[PDB]
Amino acid sequence: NDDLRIKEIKELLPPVALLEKFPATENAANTVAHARKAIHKILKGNDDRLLVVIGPCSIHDPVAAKEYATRLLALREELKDELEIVMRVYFEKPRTTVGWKGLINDPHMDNSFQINDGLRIARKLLLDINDSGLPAAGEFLDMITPQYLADLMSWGAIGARTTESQVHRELASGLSCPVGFKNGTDGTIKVAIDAINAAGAPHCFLSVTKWGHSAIVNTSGNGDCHIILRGGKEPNYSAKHVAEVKEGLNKAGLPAQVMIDFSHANSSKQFKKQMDVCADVCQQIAGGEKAIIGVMVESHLVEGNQSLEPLAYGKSITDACIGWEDTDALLRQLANAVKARRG
Amino acid sequence: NDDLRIKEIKELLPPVALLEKFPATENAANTVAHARKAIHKILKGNDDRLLVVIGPCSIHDPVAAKEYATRLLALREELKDELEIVMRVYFEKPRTTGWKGLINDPHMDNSFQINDGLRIARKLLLDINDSGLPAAGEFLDMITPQYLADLMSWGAIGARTTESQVHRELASGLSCPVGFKNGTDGTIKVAIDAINAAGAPHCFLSVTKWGHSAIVNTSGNGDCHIILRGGKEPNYSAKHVAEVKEGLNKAGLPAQVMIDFSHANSSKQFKKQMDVCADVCQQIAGGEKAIIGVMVESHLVEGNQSLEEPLAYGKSITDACIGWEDTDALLRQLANAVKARR
Amino acid sequence: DLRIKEIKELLPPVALLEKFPATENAANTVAHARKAIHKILKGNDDRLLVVIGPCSIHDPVAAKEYATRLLALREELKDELEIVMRVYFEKPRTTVGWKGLINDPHMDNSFQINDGLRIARKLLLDINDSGLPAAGEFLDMITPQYLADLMSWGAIGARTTESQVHRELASGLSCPVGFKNGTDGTIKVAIDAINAAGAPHCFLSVTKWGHSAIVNTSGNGDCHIILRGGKEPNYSAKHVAEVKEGLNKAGLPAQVMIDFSHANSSKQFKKQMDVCADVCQQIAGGEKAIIGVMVESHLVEGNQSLESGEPLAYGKSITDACIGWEDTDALLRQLANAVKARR
Amino acid sequence: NDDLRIKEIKELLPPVALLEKFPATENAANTVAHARKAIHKILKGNDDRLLVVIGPCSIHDPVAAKEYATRLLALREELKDELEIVMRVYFEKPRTTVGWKGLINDPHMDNSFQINDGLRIARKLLLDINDSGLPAAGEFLDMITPQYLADLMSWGAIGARTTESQVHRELASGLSCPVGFKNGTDGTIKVAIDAINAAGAPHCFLSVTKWGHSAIVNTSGNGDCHIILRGGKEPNYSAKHVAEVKEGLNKAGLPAQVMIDFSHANSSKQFKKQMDVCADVCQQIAGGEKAIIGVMVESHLVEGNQSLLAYGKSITDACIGWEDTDALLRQLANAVKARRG
Ligand SMILES: O=C(O)/C(=N/O)C(F)(F)F
Ligand SMILES: O=C(O)/C(=N/O)C(F)(F)F
Ligand SMILES: O=C(O)/C(=N/O)C(F)(F)F
């Protein structure tokens, strides 16, 4: 009657075992605090800077991740007048059917499934990268893994294939960080407009505590949430596309702001089209477009992606990203448009 | 940095304690054991019969629910040769934003006595099985299945969650067979990926019968199927069934489906479940063996009402359903259409 | 590690409280007896508590045939006594032996503790529901949470009266608690127990969820000394003198419960009624301080060797030897005559 | 009907959170691994050396204890041919009724009862000592603290006040290290014999795992236990008492070995008397007492004690200071020389 397609159960460290091995340093604590503050301001129209969330499609090699972090950390500080730069530290990836689930689920890319090692690796990384003063971002996919990492997160996303999940809007309503919801795979923007409304509200659901115990949590509600236009059946980063979502959100009585995602369905998957989308969004930002509050970009040390018989350094094992040299031109190419939007 | 928006945590009863208060009776386990095997044999093409998942949209009064079961159990016998009738015991009922469900606000006032809700919902589930009528629920979250899924013989995944990885991960390790609702928007590529996906072994994090996190390694679920339920327009046609039949095979999957006479297929009006029913029996009697099931929002009294004064007995507090006499006709219609085939 | 051979799962205390909840009546029993005993220890009543029953429960069938017989006398002597059946599920050995029904219910070294706790609590509930309070010994530190709400009086073993953690446990026990003198007949130890248990403590124990935590107790004031013999018996009136004024030197209620079994019987089950005579003589003589007594009683008298391994007889204790029923009615009758004779 | 007297409940970290934050180094694991084996070899009679457990009554300051530890590690390495020296690292102290409970309980010494710091201080201190080659020894009073601390322990005692308990002889029967049971608060050796025998059996009982969940546990049983002579209202360290414990151990069919506390009741409550006992046991050991296999000295940087604040002076029972401690460990290494010939 029970547990008959359940093969094994294996012990899983409680969040406090990670929270006490890898406590957040004074520096760390202050990166996330400030970074969360900064993005709040950008969302309440009290800042005109651009939230840019840029980085690999998915972490899988902490060494490569650190070269990228300290490279981008320089541009966080050179463009800190037009850009609020945040690194794309994605430990979990939702695969269309099957495939590698991210670092935390399978950190030795071998179906070992050393998920305890996973979070150890993940948390130490998230930790280190926050020390340097760079802020981190991630997709929130699992219902349990947030408790181990979220205190180091400064901006999260709910996957497209999860923007309708009640359980996922429930989670968004309690996270301490801002959150972005992606429009639906077909480009439906209301299922996301709906999640913003839910997320902004209090909920009361079942979940796991830092001690690894089932419990009932009540959430205050999170009003720092926005849409992420990722296009769908056809790219939708246009200035008039933006104007639809803009109107739409006014109809729903939510603030008219948007994060454009340059990749996936706005790039026809062609990794290099992030430059095209990039060149189109910058025109909108120069033209005076006040409502483009942020940007998401897929970006690694080296352009392209590889299958999973050895590992090319610095290159994605999942979605395909623009290389670093392109990144530089892209980020400076934003700061300039944000310059052209006020001076 | 920690827990700035979460501001209160309350104690929750572990699965192990609800299975101890309310243990499966030899009868209840018997009904679940046979009912699943019944549906498995159907789903491997080994049985003309039609699985009918029918019952209220949501349960809110255990009393009206035991009455429904005794009635529906009666018909589950009568037509046992043609229909495999499985009652539908749904608690939580997704909505963008009153009622969270029976488990979640069992007292219908935002007291959120999940613990009462859970004791109640399992006890009702228990009794319906001990009487011998299988139940079929809907798995939304990841903690709640650990308290109930032993008394369920079939399950569905909400329309707004068929795309989610976490819910396909959950179907990975269900002992009951699973149905996936196609997309809100009538698409079915998502339903296909979920079947494939839930049919793959998985390893994820989940709560145990004792209320601790752990790692699970599931086996993959082989008894899954799409669930047609409309989109822009309804899609209960046979034009439609022909596409899904095709693509399903193009997907290298068993060209079988289950049609939901409700939701986007009823174009909302609850009585239109009868219209859809009429159309299906044409096919089943026509000779369409790849319609292996149907799903009806059926209560004791037709229509619905709104939470406020007391409530009409036997009339849903959520979606409007056909009442009991529409329920008798519809079941008899289906079972007639069944043994046309011959 | 090196010496932990196996680790099986244990049903949490919440699970038994949920499968065997106090009926409204049983709640009443547990609660009236608990206030009664408090009123004895304050002098505002003058009946004699009487914890009397088997040495160890091992047949839930005989323990109910017993409880109905003992309950039948409980109601009759209502006004003299305050009978509390002896439902000890834990027993300690000088060295190695069978530890009680909870720790080995099928006395076949199966150690089916989960069955043990189910059987123990179900029996415990049957008895409080038919009006008969239960008394027990608190040996283990985790079992209490599975049973404490169905016990109206509790003892701390002669061999654990010094143990800091058994004092801590009584400091937060909700029923009232009796401490035995040292196995060598020392009072200092038991006085200290009362005093330690009289004050609040902060320590680790396990909540009703099977979870370790820090608990702050309040302190238990309904604590008294149990006299149980030593090298030679302390049921005297000479000793009752010393114990009374030693207790007044500590500055504590000058009262004492007297055991009749164990060292005061000199491991001689029948000599239990020789002690009765002496105490009813003190009690019928105007000794007000004898506020309780305890007596090892079963259906048939004597005992049998589980360590045999023939088949077992019905209603005979498998550990310490007890009187049989006929003596117990007679013993309970003289106690009631003594208490009335006392006024 | 319940919790009428439970004033409150705060969360306690699981043993695993601490095993993760202060994992044992390769070195610490080795100090432990080796020290245990040493004490096994002594116990089973295959090494004529003498286990010396020595150190403060209670760690209250960790800095003083780290200084003490270096001083004693020098001595341990210098006498390793006659002596196995492990430090007395006693966190949980058992008071006669109500008083300061020790560093794991109320670390800051003011009734905060910050048990989560305590545990944290107590494990880093133990790890630091073990990492630096010096084995450690402590009291096992609680039923839960062992799970955060056990793995950095080479030897433990069961308190004088808790030798008879089923719940403590159960614990002993699963500890990965040797154990010594003290006699009872009057000189009784019967309790200690029974304890060693019980602690030698396997047991099944309820405990908390490394994760903080109650669960069922079967022990294998612990052969590495022995009696700890500590005295009554009259000290029982003189050869006469030693020969009584000897035959008694034979009657109960146990190896006839012993460890002699120099303190508590063989000190008759004055610390400097610990030196006297030493001379006597040193006589016995050099006479050719193979029965005596270890001792226990309460020793600190500053002799004497204070109440509640001096550095390295004990703040519970009085101990000898470092000049007397150097003297004493040497007297012992010499009787261990005499004894071998
Ligand atoms: O599912 C998602 O949210 C995605 N994550 O990176 C996207 F953009 F491909 F759709
Ligand atoms: O199974 C259900 O009741 C559904 N839940 O959301 C639907 F709409 F998909 F059909
Ligand atoms: O150990 C005990 O507390 C006893 N319990 O009943 C005694 F006195 F016989 F030894």
The DSSP 8-state label assigned to residue C302 in this structure reads B
Beta strand residue intervals within C147-255, DSSP E: 153-156, 177-180, 202-206, 212-217, 223-227
Chain B residues near residue D213 by CB distance under 8 angstroms: 210, 212
Burial D184-209 (b: 16+ CB within 10 A, else e): bbebbbbbbbbbbbbbbbebbbbbbb
A neighbours by CB contacts (3+ pairs under 8 Å): B, C, D
Ligand 2 atom, smallest distance to B229 CA: 10
Q: Is the CB of A187 under 6 A from ligand 1?
A: no
Cited resolution, angstroms? 2.8
- Dist CA A284 CA A132 (whole Å): 33
Q: How far is the CA of A217 from the centre of ligand 1 (A)?
A: 27
3-state SS class at A209: coil
Query: Residue D46: exposed, middle, or buried by beta-carbon count in 10 A (0-12, 13-18, 19+)?
Result: exposed
B neighbours by CB contacts (3+ pairs under 8 Å): A, C, D
Chain D residues near residue B210 by CB distance under 8 angstroms: 213
Please report, for residues D236, D282, D290, the alpha-carbon distance to residue D286 in angstroms, rounded to integers and kept in the order given: 19, 6, 9
- How many residues are present in chain C? 343
Neighbours of A168 (CB within 10 A): 26
Please report, for residues A56, A122, C116, C168, the alpha-carbon distance to residue C156 in angstroms, rounded to integers and kept in the order given: 64, 50, 21, 11
Q: Is the CB of C182 under 6 A from ligand 3?
A: no
Residue of A nearest to D212 (CA): A211
Q: What is the least distance, in Å, from the CA of D19 to any CA of chain B?
A: 18
The enclosing H or E element of A118 equals helix A115-131
Query: Residue A17: exposed, middle, or buried by beta-carbon count in 10 A (0-12, 13-18, 19+)?
Result: buried
Contact D49, D244 (CB under 8 A): no
- Chain C residue set in contact with A, beta carbons under 8 Å: 209, 211
Kindly determine whether residue A216 and residue B114, on different chains, have CB atoms separated by under 8 Å: yes
Residues A68, A71, A73, A76: what is their CA dihedral angle, to the nearest 10 degrees? -110
Joined together, the tokens standing for residue B254 give 């068993």
- Dist CA D160 CA A116 (whole Å): 42
Ligand 2 atom, smallest distance to B159 CA: 9
User: Going by C-beta distance under 8 Å and a sequence separation of 6 or more, which residues neighbour residue D269?
Assistant: none
Q: How far is the CA of B293 from the centre of ligand 2 (A)?
A: 15
The structure's method of determination equals X-ray
Chain C residues near residue A211 by CB distance under 8 angstroms: 211
- Which residues, in sequence order, are bridge partners of residue B214? B206
Q: How far is the CA of A159 from the centre of ligand 1 (A)?
A: 5
User: Going by C-beta distance under 8 Å and a sequence separation of 6 or more, which residues neighbour residue D281?
Assistant: D237, D260, D262, D289, D292, D295, D332, D335
DSSP characters over D230-262: --SSS---SHHHHHHHHHHHHHTT----EEEES
CA C173 to chain CA mean position, Å:
13
Ligand 3 atom, smallest distance to C183 CA: 10
User: Going by C-beta distance under 8 Å and a sequence separation of 6 or more, which residues neighbour residue C44?
Assistant: none
The CA-based angle B146-B149-B153, given to 5 degrees, is 170
Ligand of minimum distance to the alpha carbon of A180: 1
For D92, what's the count of Cα atoms within 13 Å in the CB-facing half-sphere?
23
Neighbours of A309 (CB within 10 A): 4
Please report, for residues B14, B191, B244, D106, the alpha-carbon distance to residue B250 in angstroms, rounded to integers and kept in the order given: 44, 14, 9, 69
DSSP characters over A256-282: --EEEE-SGGGTTT-TTHHHHHHHHHH
User: Going by C-beta distance under 8 Å and a sequence separation of 6 or more, which residues neighbour residue D276?
Assistant: none
Look at residues C222, C287, C297 and name the one whose alpha carbon lies nearest to residue C259. Answer: C297
User: Going by C-beta distance under 8 Å and a sequence separation of 6 or more, which residues neighbour residue A341?
Assistant: A48, A285, A286, A288, A289, A290
Q: Is the CB of C180 under 6 A from ligand 3?
A: yes
3-state SS class at A226: strand
First-last CA distance in chain B: 69
Look at residues B189, B214, B190, B192 and name the one whose alpha carbon lies nearest to residue B203. Answer: B214
Neighbours of A10 (CB within 10 A): 13
Ligand of minimum distance to the alpha carbon of C135: 3
For A320, what's the count of Cα atoms within 13 Å in the CB-facing half-sphere?
14
Look at residues B214, A25, A15, C2 and name the one whose alpha carbon lies nearest to residue D16. Answer: A15
Please report, for residues A68, A93, A338, C246, D161, the alpha-carbon distance to residue A296 in angstroms, rounded to integers and kept in the order given: 16, 16, 15, 80, 67
Kindly determine whether residue D12 and residue C92, on different chains, have CB atoms separated by under 8 Å: no
Q: How far is the CA of B159 from the centre of ligand 2 (A)?
A: 6
- Dist CA D202 CA C109 (whole Å): 11
Q: Secondary structure of chain B in the HEC alphabet?
A: CCCCCEEEEEECCCHHHHHHHCCCCHHHHHHHHHHHHHHHHHHCCCCCCEEEEEECCCCCCHHHHHHHHHHHHHHHHHCCCCEEEEEECCCCCCCCCCCCCCCCCCCCCCCCCHHHHHHHHHHHHHHHHHCCCCEEEECCCCCHHHHCHHHEEEEEECHHHCCCHHHHHHHHCCCCCEEEECCCCCCCHHHHHHHHHHCCCCEEEEECCCCEEEEEEECCCCCEEEEECCCCCCCCCCHHHHHHHHHHHHCCCCCCEEEECCHHHCCCCCCHHHHHHHHHHHHHHHCCCCEEEEEEEECCEEEECCCCCCCCCCEECCCCEECHHHHHHHHHHHHHHHHHCC
Kindly determine whether residue C174 and residue D144, on different chains, have CB atoms separated by under 8 Å: no
- Dist CA C206 CA C143 (whole Å): 10
The CA-based angle D14-D19-D21, given to 5 degrees, is 100
Q: Is the CB of C185 under 6 A from ligand 3?
A: no
- Chain D residue set in contact with B, beta carbons under 8 Å: 211, 213
Look at residues C46, C45, C26, C128 and name the one whose alpha carbon lies nearest to residue C85. Answer: C128
Q: What is the CA radius of gyration of chain A?
A: 19
- Dist CA B99 CA B83 (whole Å): 32
- Dist CA D20 CA A337 (whole Å): 48
The CA-based angle D41-D44-D46, given to 5 degrees, is 55
Beta strand residue intervals within A38-135, DSSP E: 50-55, 83-88
Joined together, the tokens standing for residue A124 give 């130490």
Among B181, B257, B297, the mutation site with the greatest number of ligand 2 atoms within 8 A of its Cβ is: B181
Q: What is the least distance, in Å, from the CA of C215 to any CA of chain A?
A: 17
3-state SS class at C335: helix
Q: How far is the CA of C258 from the centre of ligand 3 (A)?
A: 12
Instruction: Report the amino acid identity of residue D181.
Output: F
- Which residues, in sequence order, are bridge partners of residue B183? none
- Dist CA D61 CA D125 (whole Å): 10
Q: Which of D166, D208, D217 sits opposite C206 (nearest CB)?
A: D208
Look at residues C124, C132, C137, C156 and name the one whose alpha carbon lies nearest to residue C82. Answer: C132
Residue with tokens 């969302």: A43
- Dist CA B54 CA B75 (whole Å): 12
Give nearest CA residue, ligand 1 atom 9: A264
Ligand 3 atom, smallest distance to C259 CA: 8
